[PDB]
Amino acid sequence: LEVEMMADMYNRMTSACHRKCVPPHYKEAELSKGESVCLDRCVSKYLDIHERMGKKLTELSMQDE
């Protein structure tokens, strides 16, 4: 089940890095040096944020009991 629900955060993560790193002007058809970097950083920060959530949340799945 780690697949059907991984390929998900992927589409989510993609849709997201897109919004935050790609402006709707589409003046030029190839990635901007900067745009290229922004994506990278985003992709990473996205993954980071993704884990500590699974962690912090799991914590509160035990503690509560």
């Binding site: 998900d8 955060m9 997201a16 920060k45 959530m53």
Partner: protein, 63 residues
Amino acid sequence: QFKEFLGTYNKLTETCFLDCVKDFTTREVKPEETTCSEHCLQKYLKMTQRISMRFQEYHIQQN
């Protein structure tokens, strides 16, 4: 039915990422944002609970 918690888990992560991570300079979360996402989790969680309760308090009326 465990495919509910996981989708909702992603639905969540995405969100918190969206509202909490603004301006990308390095590939490691800034403290300011660090807390932001942490809270975004609690807030959002409580929320789904309340809504959930207020939802149950509906079927009672008809039943």
